[PDB]
Design a protein around this nucleic acid. Structure first.
Ligand SMILES: [Cl-]
Ligand SMILES: [Cl-]
Ligand SMILES: [Cl-]
Ligand SMILES: [Cl-]
Ligand SMILES: [Mn+2]
Ligand SMILES: [Mn+2]
Ligand SMILES: [Mn+2]
Ligand SMILES: [Mn+2]
Ligand SMILES: [Mn+2]
Ligand SMILES: [Mn+2]
Ligand SMILES: [Mn+2]
Ligand SMILES: [Mn+2]
Ligand SMILES: [Mn+2]
Ligand SMILES: [Mn+2]
Ligand SMILES: [Mn+2]
Lengths: 93, 99, 86, 105, 108, 94, 78, 97
DNA sequence: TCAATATCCACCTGCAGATTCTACCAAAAGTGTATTTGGAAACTGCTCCATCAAAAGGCATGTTCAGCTGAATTCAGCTGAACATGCCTTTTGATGGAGCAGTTTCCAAATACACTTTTGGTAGAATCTGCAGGTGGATATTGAT
DNA sequence: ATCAATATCCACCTGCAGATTCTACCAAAAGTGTATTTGGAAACTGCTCCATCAAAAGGCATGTTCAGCTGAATTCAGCTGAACATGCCTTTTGATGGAGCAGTTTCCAAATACACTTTTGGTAGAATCTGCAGGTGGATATTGA
């Protein structure tokens, strides 16, 4: 059948920071868990945020407030910039 | 003589008394001031529903009382009867509030 | 239209009030240094809750922190509070 | 036709993140930027950990990142450690640490 | 048409089956919600509020009051092993704590 | 004036059933509402998760039941499960 | 079977945990805790199994149970 | 005809095991304990091999963690030897009791 | 300080379990269309939040004093560590059969829709009442002698 | 083995703040007649899970010393509790202006629902390559002297 994971993406990102480094299967498994967990945490909080404010749509504004409430200081700042950077670029050309 | 209760007697009197009651133990106004100060340092020109301040005081006191229970167990465990900073620190480290 | 400056209000949490809280917590004897550690611990507790609460206030584009903001802020921190649900 | 990831300039699957938000029962509707934003956040954190784990590997004379390395990068970083404070990395062990009072001499 | 029978009376319940059904649909829990789901949930909730009101009511009586207040709710909860666990991370405003002094602290 | 819903009416009925003589202050009623909303959240939440882990798009009384077994401790679970089932079979009897 | 969890194995765990000296009563104490931990988790897992109408406990069932008990594990499907 | 003094080898093991990551409980005994307990919730169950590993990993990360808090409680009482009393206090403060 | 025993630490080395590649099909993701509709302005009706004034007594503050608690010093009885000895339970595969997840292929039962019609609930109003707050006598409790 | 000094426990009042009951309007359950979809059901089909075997070989169970740790005993400097005198500043009430929550409508810009067209990611064999696990030899770290 088929089982989709974030492997190829984690791997792509791996090569950009450490072109020389590889990653074992057990480690790739750990990165998957990591991505799924953070995904759930952010989505889940954005879900509550929209519900508290009686909105039926989760916009980038909810994902951002969620990131702020979820990630520690510097991680939040950097994550917030990367996020608005990606949305900005996506909205242009 | 005058009469003098021995040290510890009044303290035990106080435990029974406060564990019997449910009112807040920190003064209202000072606590409201502390909230507005901390808040102000995060974002200016904020306002507070009266309920919000009370919700915060209820939560802080429930938290300190609970922390002192744990702190008290740590002192006793060290065969003492006087809670000390190191006891409060041991409790928070084990509560994962800060390993 | 100037409210006075807010400073040192943490000292508003007096020695007597902390002694009472330890009492309810069943503590019999209190070291002289407990009071400053306690204020420090309360300060951290309060900031994290207020920070999260104010974050919910802003996302709702309000200038007023409501009791619900605090309730969600406390629930986030695994410190669920009953009695102010609205 | 070019992917939304490339358009957003990301390595993470914007399309998949969008489908996952819609099907995860989080809200009734999903804005177009939310998948972009979310994917960026996930990519960034992913790069942060791989960067430090890569380093942990190098400091071990290893070129392949393994579980132990992810554990050393995480627990040795204040922020990452706090974020994953209630998470356990299988096969990662613990940081070498012996309480002073237990040493001899 | 036919007689209007509430789903609650149809289920032999006090709690609002209709209200609970809408909350499930509007809470974004799943794409679709089965008919028996809100009936089963309304009953569990009702059973639980009956269990703690039974116990709270007793604490009220013990303290010679006829009106249940927050402290009464605290006593009922913390004194019941099971409810205490269910609500182990919940704080009841104006509930105080259970009277409890460690043995070592009592006068020797 | 956007009316605000609550479970007070039902909490009060149930109260009269167990303690005919007893009343309840508004603060205590405030706590009861929080309690009902909290447990509903926990159960639906777990039910939601459960249905998702099994590629099921609908939450049935069966999801609510497993949620209940997972969330409530021992006896409380046994009893809540009985009442739940009893209510469903009765409801289906039209 | 709990006794299968041996003294030396408990010593090792203790060691990785940085423990230098171990009292004789710790061994039996540890099995009790180990047993409560496993019971609470397995019970939750089998409940996810029985719900999925299977007769096989899957890694995911364990991962979901662990998450519920506040012991999130990375490496086995989440 | 020589011996290392009490504690020297203990420290040596702390160092060894804090450096490694292998599971410290023997596999078979563990699998056996797992199935015995499960058997009480549902009879005739089968286990993916990876489900048993996930369990052993969690279980060992939990005990190692618990021993840290216990070591801290023992040191708190001016000891260097952990005791049931220390595991009890740690589990009490963690709210597991 | 010596001198010996048992630990570590290095630098090389070679096979092997994983890894990284290479070669193809289907679901997913990207498009071009047609509809929908969430919730962003643009007001504005009213809660209820911030402030001010004033008086009064509950309580915080700052001291004196000395009870008894935490902390430092000994001491020796045992518990728990280090080890050499001896043995069986765990580990490692390989085979084989079978139980049982995953699917495919239906369809009858159960849900979602659309919208009309029929009340249970909720926002005050009005009416009804626990019990907070006071106040003196038991009933004790505590602590000196 | 009292007594005296206080703190605590109770039952008796009763008017005020709240709680409970009385009234009406909807917002939203309940009814019905379609239109759609879910997921329970046989039948199979591999995947991977238990058994069953064997060796070996660690790794564990036992006993023997005894090192050095924990816990019992003592001693005492001075910290922290109890009691007091003072008088500050939190509380308790009321009143007022007006910031800013909601509560209404009005209407795109942005999201959903479709029908296709095209690309990408998951698979199942290929084609290496990072170190695990030894070897050996060289200082280390411990320990007994
Ligand atoms: Cl200290
Ligand atoms: Cl968006
Ligand atoms: Cl159902
Ligand atoms: Cl013990
Ligand atoms: Mn400031
Ligand atoms: Mn609209
Ligand atoms: Mn003064
Ligand atoms: Mn003296
Ligand atoms: Mn002492
Ligand atoms: Mn000796
Ligand atoms: Mn009516
Ligand atoms: Mn009274
Ligand atoms: Mn205005
Ligand atoms: Mn491709
Ligand atoms: Mn090596």
């Amino acid at each position: 059948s088929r089982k989709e994971s974030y492997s190829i993406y984690v791997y792509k990102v791996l090569k950009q920071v450490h072109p020389d480094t590889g990653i074992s299967s057990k480690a790739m498994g750990i990165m998957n868990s990591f991505v799924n967990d953070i995904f759930e945490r952010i989505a889940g909080e954005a879900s509550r945020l929209a519900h508290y404010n009686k909105r039926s749509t989760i916009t980038s504004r909810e994902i951002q407030t969620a990131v702020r409430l979820l990630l520690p200081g510097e991680l939040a700042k950097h994550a917030v910039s990367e996020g608005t950077k990606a949305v900005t670029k996506y909205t242009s050309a | 003589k005058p009469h003098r209760y021995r040290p510890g007697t009044v303290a035990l009197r106080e435990i029974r008394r406060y564990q019997k009651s449910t009112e807040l133990l920190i003064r209202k106004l000072p606590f409201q001031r502390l909230v507005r100060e901390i808040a102000q340092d995060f974002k200016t020109d904020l306002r507070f529903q009266s309920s919000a301040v009370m919700a915060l005081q209820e939560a802080c006191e429930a938290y300190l009382v609970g922390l002192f229970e744990d702190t008290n167990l740590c002192a006793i465990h060290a065969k003492r009867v006087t809670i000390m900073p190191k006891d409060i620190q041991l409790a928070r480290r084990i509560r994962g509030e800060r390993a | 239209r100037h409210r006075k400056v807010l400073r040192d209000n943490i000292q508003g949490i007096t020695k007597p009030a902390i002694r009472r809280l330890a009492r309810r917590g069943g503590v019999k004897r209190i070291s002289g240094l407990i009071y400053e550690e306690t204020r420090g611990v309360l300060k951290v507790f309060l900031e994290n809750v207020i920070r999260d609460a104010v974050t919910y206030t802003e996302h709702a584009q309000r200038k007023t922190v409501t009791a619900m903001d605090v309730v969600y802020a406390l629930k986030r921190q695994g410190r669920t509070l009953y009695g102010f649900g609205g | 036709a070019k992917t939304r990831s490339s358009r957003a300039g990301l390595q993470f699957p914007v399309g998949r993140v969008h489908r996952l938000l819609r099907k995860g029962n989080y809200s009734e509707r999903v804005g177009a930027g939310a998948p972009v934003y979310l994917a960026a956040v996930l990519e960034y954190l992913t790069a942060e950990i791989l960067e430090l784990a890569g380093n942990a590997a190098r400091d071990n004379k290893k070129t392949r990142i393994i579980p132990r390395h992810l554990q050393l990068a995480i627990r040795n970083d204040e922020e990452l450690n706090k974020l994953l404070g209630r998470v356990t990395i299988a096969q990662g062990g613990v940081l070498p640490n012996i309480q002073a009072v237990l040493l001899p001499k």
